[PDB]
């Protein structure tokens, strides 16, 4: 390296073997990503199939009990376990695998291996971009899913009472987590979540608009009715009319893109910024620092029996979510609340 | 004192903005501008280890400084006192105040040793080219990495409480409320008196 | 104000279930030593044997301003139960600072929130800077090669 | 190079896959039908959900003695 003799060691041979074109690229990052990701997906598929949740949550979340794909899940450990890492060799399981499954240790297994798999995957993105000599904008974009995963599956339960309040790996489990954030945190009212929603919706809009515009400015490039075969990667000309696209969107929307650089950087920028803002919001929620209330509105409605808004309706709905969900949601709290103290409307 | 220091640093910043073409920043071998970043790191690590050792052996132990805040386990009586270091496994107890002087003494000694090692020993060519040690952007990335590592650590110790996070100074803890710390102690005192 | 201690009509010590951190608001219930619900401040107020005015609980208090003042009949028992679900009942002056009413966060919570947000932002900053320092040749230009 | 089109067409693939795939399917079938899935992954049988002592949802309510306790309130 740098015009030097550089007598070869084991590292040169290992690097030469790892950095080779194959059916699947391995690289140095494959020493972490491949085992961690394989173990995460295998543990999730195993927990959704055989591992029960009857001990920790008091519910059935596996295929061996009668749950669907949208229903079975790898459930979090019990709240009394706290933020225990829940190793097999740890003081909880004590080297017993069939009770480690019953204690919710598979959730910690899948979560830690998924985090290290995400680390290894974005390292793999770095390594492949360095091998092909391209800028790692894919890794920069993938930094936002990693941030969302870290803030949601790690930072929020570490801020809360324990891993029990983390999202269980599933579908109905994630729906429970979402409704819990609605009822207990007022997560829709959070401006960071609003920014994240705007980012995702704008990114989907950008994807649809860019695809439709390119497919509708495709030039002739052939004689057949199928334009897909009119494309040639060898030619050095652009496959679509940027001038026509710019004039169309300038006369339709008022504004249009004039630079492909700026267009694709915006397509990169919008979802990453949205997901990072949502990650910051979930970090704020990790310590129950929630944008739950509007003080002026609540004082106005406290001194006025007439003043009602949709926000007051949402607050009333959140109260019902909390009251009617806590008793069967948190078995550690032992909330044996009678039905009369639970709030009701009229006749329902 | 912080305000006077801020003014002095402002004046030094103005002087360094105006007088930037100092021969100290120029390489004698080639004449171009360069920084010997491994040697700068060795000097800075030596200074950081000296500060850590001094803070842990003179300030917090009270042989020259005042010490640190030590309080009751329930935060009733607390004051700034000298702290004897704990060199056993109890020194790794997060709520043990003795683990802070022992940590700072040992880490300062080790930082001084590592700074001397970096002052005396040059990096290898493979590691220099792999980490781009001749570039300031690489040390920027590594420093930022260490900085948010430390930020995550201080946030965790802040949220879960420690000996360096007194209740009488930062308030109680949500885990103290959930786990019935003060409630259990109050009920135990009432039961013992009754 | 003191420790609000609640007794039934025939006489047994009830306890107000304390509010967890997840709940912006919590139902006011008073449950038994064994762990069975015995009274509450009901929402519907037209059913069962748990409303305060028919269970007949009394609050005694054993502390500073209220040391032997026993209240049994009016809604002050319900008010003290609602205050007791928040922990120890304390007297507050809300006119000096024109206090809001909603609970605020500790400096511990503010420090933790600011530092965790800064920690993720600096994770992104480190990832971007490591990208830029490993990929300097392609961030500047490879010159058709 | 075997681009995954020639191997699926060849009979050499299906001679050795007429045994391995059905054997794996039968192995999973017997793994379920022999109760080995219940024994290995600790999921309770439909008749092993409620013991005579407790007729409600179980609670772990302990951390350092969680192994002993789950052995206590499991299905023996």
């Amino acid at each position: 390296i740098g015009t030097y003799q550089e007598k070869r060691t084991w590292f040169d041979d290992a690097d030469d073997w790892l950095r080779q074109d194959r059916f699947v690229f391995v690289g140095w990052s494959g020493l972490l990503l491949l085992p961690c990701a394989y173990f995460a997906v295998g543990g999730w598929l195993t927990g959704c199939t055989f591992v029960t949740s009857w001990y920790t949550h008091g519910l059935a979340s596996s295929y061996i009990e009668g749950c669907n794909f949208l229903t079975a899940a790898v459930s979090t450990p019990a709240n009394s376990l706290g933020h225990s890492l829940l190793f097999v060799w740890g003081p909880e399981a004590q080297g017993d695998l069939t009770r480690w499954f019953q204690l919710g240790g598979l959730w910690a297994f899948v979560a830690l291996h998924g985090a290290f798999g995400l680390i290894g995957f974005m390292l793999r993105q770095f390594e492949i971009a360095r091998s092909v000599n391209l800028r790692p904008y894919n890794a920069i974009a993938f930094s936002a899913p990693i941030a969302v995963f870290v803030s949601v599956f790690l930072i929020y339960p570490l801020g809360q009472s324990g891993w029990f309040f983390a999202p269980s790996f599933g579908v109905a489990s994630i729906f429970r987590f979402i409704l819990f954030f609605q009822g207990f945190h007022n997560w829709t009212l959070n401006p960071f979540h609003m920014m994240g929603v705007a980012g995702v919706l704008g990114a989907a809009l950008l994807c649809a608009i860019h695809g439709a515009t390119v497919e509708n400015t495709l030039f002739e490039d052939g004689d057949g009715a199928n334009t897909f075969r009119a494309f040639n990667p060898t030619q050095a000309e652009e496959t679509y009319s940027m001038v026509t696209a710019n004039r169309f969107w300038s006369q339709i929307f008022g504004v249009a893109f004039s630079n492909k650089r700026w267009l694709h950087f915006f397509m990169l920028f919008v979802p990453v910024t949205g997901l990072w803002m949502s990650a910051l919001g979930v970090v704020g929620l990790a310590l129950n620092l929630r944008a739950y209330d509007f003080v002026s509105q609540e004082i106005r409605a406290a001194e006025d029996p007439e003043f009602e808004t949709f926000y007051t309706k949402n607050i009333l709905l959140n109260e019902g979510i909390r009251a009617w969900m806590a008793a069967q949601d948190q078995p550690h709290e032992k909330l044996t609340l009678p039905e009369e103290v639970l709030p009701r409307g009229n006749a329902l | 004192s912080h305000i006077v220091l801020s003014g002095l640093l402002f004046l030094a910043s103005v002087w360094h903005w105006v007088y930037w073409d100092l021969e100290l920043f120029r390489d004698p071998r080639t004449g171009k501008t360069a920084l010997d970043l491994p040697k700068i790191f060795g000097i800075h690590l030596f200074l950081a280890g000296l500060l850590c050792f001094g803070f842990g052996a003179f300030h917090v132990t009270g042989v020259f400084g005042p010490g640190i805040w030590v309080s009751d386990p329930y935060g009733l009586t607390g004051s700034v006192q000298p702290v004897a270091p704990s060199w056993g496994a109890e020194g790794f107890d997060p709520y043990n105040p003795g683990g802070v002087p022992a940590h700072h003494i040992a880490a300062g000694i080790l930082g001084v040793l590592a700074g001397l090692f970096h002052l005396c020993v040059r990096p290898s060519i493979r590691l220099y080219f792999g980490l781009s040690m001749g570039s300031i952007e690489s040390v920027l990335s590594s420093s930022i990495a260490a900085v948010f590592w430390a930020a995550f650590v201080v946030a965790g110790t802040m949220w879960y409480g420690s000996a360096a996070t007194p209740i009488e100074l930062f308030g109680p803890t949500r885990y103290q409320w959930d786990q019935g710390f003060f409630q259990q102690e109050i009920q135990k005192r009432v039961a013992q008196s009754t | 104000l003191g420790h609000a201690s609640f007794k039934d009509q025939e006489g047994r010590e009830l306890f107000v279930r304390r509010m967890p951190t997840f709940f912006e608001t919590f139902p006011v219930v008073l449950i038994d030593k064994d762990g069975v619900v015995r009274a509450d401040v009901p929402f519907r107020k037209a059913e069962s044997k748990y409303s305060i005015e028919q269970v007949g609980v009394s609050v005694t208090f054993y502390g500073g301003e209220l040391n032997g003042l026993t209240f049994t009949d009016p809604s002050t028992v319900k008010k003290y139960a609602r205050k007791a679900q928040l922990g120890e009942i304390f007297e507050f002056d809300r006119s000096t600072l024109q206090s809001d009413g909603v609970f605020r966060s500790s400096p511990r919570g503010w420090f933790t929130f600011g530092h965790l947000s800064f920690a993720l932002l600096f994770f992104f900053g480190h990832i971007w800077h490591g990208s830029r320092t490993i990929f300097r040749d392609v961030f500047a230009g490879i010159d058709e090669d | 190079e075997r681009p995954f089109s020639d191997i699926l067409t060849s009979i050499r693939y299906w001679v050795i896959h007429s045994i391995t795939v059905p054997s794996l399917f039968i192995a999973g079938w017997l793994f379920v039908s022999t109760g080995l899935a219940y024994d290995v992954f600790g999921s309770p049988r439909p008749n092993e959900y409620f013991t005579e002592d407790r007729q409600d949802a179980p609670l772990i309510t302990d951390r350092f003695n969680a192994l002993e306790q789950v052995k206590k309130l499991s299905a023996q």
């Binding site: 709290e333 | 019935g180 259990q184 039961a191 | 009830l14 279930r17 | 306790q69």
Partner: peptide, 27 residues
């Protein structure tokens, strides 16, 4: 003094107490 009574004393108000979550096997 009475560790059984004080454990039951804090039983109704708060189910998440350390004193409850420790040594719950014997109960």
């Amino acid at each position: 003094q009475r560790v059984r009574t004080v454990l039951d004393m804090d039983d109704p108000a708060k189910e998440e107490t350390v004193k409850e979550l420790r040594k719950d096997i014997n109960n």
